[PDB]
Enzyme design. Structure first.
Site, short mmCIF file in Angstrom:
data_model
loop_
_atom_site.label_atom_id
_atom_site.label_comp_id
_atom_site.label_asym_id
_atom_site.label_seq_id
_atom_site.Cartn_x
_atom_site.Cartn_y
_atom_site.Cartn_z
N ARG A 299 -4.07 -10.44 -10.22
CA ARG A 299 -5.16 -9.46 -10.31
C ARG A 299 -5.44 -9.19 -11.79
O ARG A 299 -4.61 -9.51 -12.65
CB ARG A 299 -4.79 -8.15 -9.59
CG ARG A 299 -4.30 -8.29 -8.15
CD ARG A 299 -5.05 -9.34 -7.37
NE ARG A 299 -4.82 -9.22 -5.93
CZ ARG A 299 -4.84 -10.23 -5.06
NH1 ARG A 299 -5.07 -11.49 -5.44
NH2 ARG A 299 -4.62 -9.98 -3.77
N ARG B 77 -1.89 -8.33 5.32
CA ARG B 77 -1.03 -7.25 4.87
C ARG B 77 -0.76 -6.19 5.94
O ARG B 77 0.36 -5.62 6.01
CB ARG B 77 -1.61 -6.63 3.61
CG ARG B 77 -1.47 -7.54 2.41
CD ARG B 77 -2.24 -7.07 1.20
NE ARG B 77 -2.11 -8.04 0.11
CZ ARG B 77 -1.11 -8.11 -0.76
NH1 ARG B 77 -0.09 -7.25 -0.73
NH2 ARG B 77 -1.11 -9.06 -1.69
N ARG C 222 -8.63 -0.55 -1.66
CA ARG C 222 -8.65 -1.72 -2.53
C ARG C 222 -10.01 -2.42 -2.36
O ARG C 222 -10.18 -3.27 -1.49
CB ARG C 222 -7.48 -2.65 -2.21
CG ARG C 222 -6.12 -1.95 -2.35
CD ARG C 222 -4.95 -2.85 -2.01
NE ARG C 222 -3.69 -2.22 -2.37
CZ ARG C 222 -2.50 -2.81 -2.27
NH1 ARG C 222 -2.38 -4.05 -1.84
NH2 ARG C 222 -1.42 -2.13 -2.65
N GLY D 82 0.82 -1.22 0.00
CA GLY D 82 0.00 0.00 0.00
C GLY D 82 0.85 1.27 0.00
O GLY D 82 0.32 2.37 0.00
N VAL D 83 2.17 1.12 -0.02
CA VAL D 83 3.06 2.30 0.02
C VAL D 83 3.37 2.93 -1.32
O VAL D 83 3.93 4.03 -1.36
CB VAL D 83 4.38 1.97 0.76
CG1 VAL D 83 5.40 1.25 -0.17
CG2 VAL D 83 4.95 3.21 1.38
N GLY D 84 3.01 2.27 -2.41
CA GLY D 84 3.25 2.78 -3.77
C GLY D 84 4.62 2.48 -4.35
O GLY D 84 5.05 3.13 -5.30
N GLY E 235 5.52 -0.10 -6.14
CA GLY E 235 5.35 -0.60 -7.50
C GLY E 235 5.33 0.54 -8.51
O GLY E 235 6.02 0.50 -9.54
N1 LIG Z 1 10.91 -12.21 -0.39
C1 LIG Z 1 10.30 -11.86 -1.52
N2 LIG Z 1 9.30 -10.96 -1.46
C2 LIG Z 1 8.69 -10.60 -2.62
C3 LIG Z 1 9.08 -11.10 -3.83
N3 LIG Z 1 8.29 -10.54 -4.77
C4 LIG Z 1 7.44 -9.72 -4.15
N4 LIG Z 1 7.68 -9.78 -2.84
C5 LIG Z 1 7.02 -9.00 -1.77
O1 LIG Z 1 5.83 -9.61 -1.30
C6 LIG Z 1 4.96 -8.56 -0.81
C7 LIG Z 1 3.58 -8.72 -1.39
O2 LIG Z 1 3.58 -8.49 -2.80
P1 LIG Z 1 2.21 -8.29 -3.58
O3 LIG Z 1 1.40 -9.56 -3.31
O4 LIG Z 1 1.63 -7.04 -2.96
O5 LIG Z 1 2.59 -8.10 -5.03
C8 LIG Z 1 5.64 -7.24 -1.18
O6 LIG Z 1 6.38 -6.77 -0.05
C9 LIG Z 1 6.58 -7.62 -2.27
O7 LIG Z 1 7.67 -6.69 -2.42
C10 LIG Z 1 10.13 -12.02 -3.84
O8 LIG Z 1 10.56 -12.52 -4.90
N5 LIG Z 1 10.69 -12.36 -2.70
#
Ligand SMILES: Nc1nc2c(ncn2[C@@H]2O[C@H](COP(=O)(O)O)[C@@H](O)[C@H]2O)c(=O)[nH]1
Length: 196
Positions: free
Chosen positions: A44, A150, A139, A14-16, A18
């Site tokens: 998604r 989260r 969201r 949620g911090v932006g 990406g």
């Molecule tokens: N340890 C690890 N964390 C990841 C990897 N890819 C994404 N994440 C982290 O998992 C969290 C959730 O990602 P989201 O589901 O929001 O895309 C975020 O903190 C993201 O940076 C990865 O390859 N390894």
């Protein structure tokens, strides 16, 4: 002589971060290669398999892990995430800076890895926790349990970020302002870097 250090971006959901990463890739598309992580979480509707993540089932994630495909992995919010050795290798073969996005446990693992000698580690903070919780709530489609997890990860992340060894902490209050700050940090940190 040392390879160019990977850029590692971390912060709570949620911090932006990406969007900030997409801006880096927009200004410097010939300079960085984004590491496409594997994840077991559901894709998604406007994410793309093989761009944002490789979306795999938990069986295939485990197989990949046991076959030695990952540099690091973690469970985050009931799903598995992992950085592929092959993706780092592609950045290296292309002569590019590898750009990773991972959580704090992934950061801890990369820092102890013998596959990568150094890195530039950035933690992205929200202007306030209250604002971040509000952003997560906006969201519309995520389930309460998903949001719950989260927010639980958030608590740990905010608690531990100070102890992990980040090179830079940046507050994402406004994307234009924050990116203007971030790009100057990157240009200062990577004397090799220019636009395009
Ligand atoms: N340890 C690890 N964390 C990841 C990897 N890819 C994404 N994440 C982290 O998992 C969290 C959730 O990602 P989201 O589901 O929001 O895309 C975020 O903190 C993201 O940076 C990865 O390859 N390894």
């Amino acid at each position: 002589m040392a390879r160019i250090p990977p850029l590692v971006v971390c912060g709570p959901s949620g911090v932006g971060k990406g969007t900030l990463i997409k801006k880096v890739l927009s200004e410097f598309p010939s300079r960085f290669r984004f590491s496409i992580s594997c994840t077991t979480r559901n894709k998604r509707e406007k994410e793309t398999n093989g761009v944002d993540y490789y979306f795999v089932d938990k069986d295939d994630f485990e197989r990949k892990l046991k076959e030695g495909q990952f540099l690091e992995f973690d469970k985050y919010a009931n799903n598995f995430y992992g950085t592929l050795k092959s993706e780092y290798d592609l950045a290296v073969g292309e002569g590019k800076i590898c750009l990773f996005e991972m959580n704090i446990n992934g950061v801890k693992q990369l820092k102890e890895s013998k596959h990568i000698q150094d890195g530039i580690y950035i933690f992205v903070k929200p202007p306030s926790i209250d604002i971040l919780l509000g952003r997560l709530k906006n969201r519309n489609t995520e389930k309460p349990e998903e949001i719950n997890k989260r927010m639980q990860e958030l608590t740990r992340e905010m608690d531990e970020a100070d102890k992990v060894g980040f090179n830079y902490f940046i507050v994402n209050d406004d994307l234009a302002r924050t990116y203007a700050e971030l790009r100057e940090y990157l240009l200062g940190s990577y004397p090799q870097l220019r636009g395009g």
